[PDB]
Structure 1
Amino acid sequence: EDEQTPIHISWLSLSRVNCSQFLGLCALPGCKFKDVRRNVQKDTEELKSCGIQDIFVFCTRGELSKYRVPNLLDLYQQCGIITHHHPIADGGTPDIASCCEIMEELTTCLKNYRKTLIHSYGGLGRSCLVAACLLLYLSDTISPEQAIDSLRDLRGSGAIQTIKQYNYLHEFRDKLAAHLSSR
């Protein structure tokens, strides 16, 4: 069991949103908290062993230290990984303008065949939300209902856990458009 088992990565197919790419999801690399501890460096290496170019992190300096992975971003830095920090409040949802950057950058990476991996702490909340959003974002035909099942298929029936997340998903398309204010 645990910590010395190589770091898992759930590869989500983006074909049903008509993309050939795959997006990757995992839990905090190196996380040491509640019945969960690991080796940052080692996990971090396995990723590079795994082929990872770009990495999207949704924690917060606040969280990186609380899980004892302060330098995480750096270990990523000096490991060949282009990291994109996009903290999302814990137990929260991103503001549309932030959530928007994520979709963009994320999309680009894929458009440009980059081995992209995303994560927050638990990988069952924030990251599922964000991945679910990219589905609604690469397709105007896919239903919130569906994208959810997509992640549930990927990560378990505990996919989008919260209700705030569920609501957020059903309103992403609107709020995203409502970001119509080209300005």
Structure 2
Amino acid sequence: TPIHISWLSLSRVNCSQFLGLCALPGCKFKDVRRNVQKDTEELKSCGIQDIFVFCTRGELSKYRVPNLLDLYQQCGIITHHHPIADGGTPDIASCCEIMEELTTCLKNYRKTLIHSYGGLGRSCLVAACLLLYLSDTISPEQAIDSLRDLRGSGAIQTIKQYNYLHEFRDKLAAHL
């Protein structure tokens, strides 16, 4: 099979663009045997221009895709690797850099895709953060609902992540 991308509409934050989310491309784990090169080519063939990866180095090793980043760039895709702990959250400085690189991809009209291990939690956390980021009217609860509607009730994984969403605005406000 291909690799499925779940496209998030950003119209709720006044944006014509869509943001793509997915699970680990080329992942090879129990019962899951993907072809990292075919997947890459597929994404490339789809028009993907920029890809954000939140999987750590260890994971890329575990799931036998250590040169994931390599392959993406070999295919002409700009790769944004910002490791976030499985079940964890990004510090404010890193999450801030992610928001900025994402916003730029959109303002440039770049077909953008983001992924974690299972595209459910770390990825939804960043996606939901981007909604709060681009809108000052949407609630954490609402941003969570939008991703829940896209990824399922398991959109956000841990209460640590829920906790980050609530107050992400305040933590981000903390700007010296």
> TM-score, normalization: structure 2?
0.97
**Partner residue of 2:2?**
6
In structure 2, distance between residues paired with 1:157 and 1:125 = 11
Asked if 1 retains the 8 angstrom alpha-carbon contact of 2:125 and 2:165, the reply is yes
How many residue pairs match? The answer is: 176
Asked if 1 retains the 8 angstrom alpha-carbon contact of 2:54 and 2:83, the reply is yes
In structure 1, distance between residues paired with 2:86 and 2:120 = 12
Asked if 1 retains the 8 angstrom alpha-carbon contact of 2:87 and 2:157, the reply is no
> How far 1:31 moved relative to its partner?
0.8
> How far 1:158 moved relative to its partner?
1.2
**What SS does structure 1 have at the residue aligned with 2:167?**
helix
Q: Which runs of 5+ in 2 are unaligned?
A: none
> How far 1:37 moved relative to its partner?
2.0
Deviation per residue, 1:36-85 (Å, 9 max, x gap): 22110011111011110000001121211111001100110110100011
- Percentage of pairs with the same residue: 100
In structure 2, distance between residues paired with 1:37 and 1:101 = 33
Asked if 2 retains the 8 angstrom alpha-carbon contact of 1:97 and 1:179, the reply is no
Deviation per residue, 1:78-99 (Å, 9 max, x gap): 1010001101112210000000
Structure 1 runs of 4+ aligned residues shifted over 3 Å read none
Instruction: Report the more deviating stretch, 67-76 or 171-180.
Output: 171-180
Deviation per residue, 1:98-153 (Å, 9 max, x gap): 00000000000001100000011011110010101000000010011111111111
1:106 matched to 2:102: yes
Please report the RMSD computed on the Cα atoms of aligned residues, expressed in angstroms.
Answer: 0.9
Asked if 2 retains the 8 angstrom alpha-carbon contact of 1:31 and 1:68, the reply is yes
Asked if 2 retains the 8 angstrom alpha-carbon contact of 1:96 and 1:179, the reply is no
Asked if 2 retains the 8 angstrom alpha-carbon contact of 1:160 and 1:166, the reply is yes
Asked if 2 retains the 8 angstrom alpha-carbon contact of 1:51 and 1:115, the reply is yes
Q: Which runs of 5+ in 1 are unaligned?
A: none
> How far 1:25 moved relative to its partner?
0.3
> TM-score, normalization: structure 1?
0.94
> How far 1:161 moved relative to its partner?
2.2
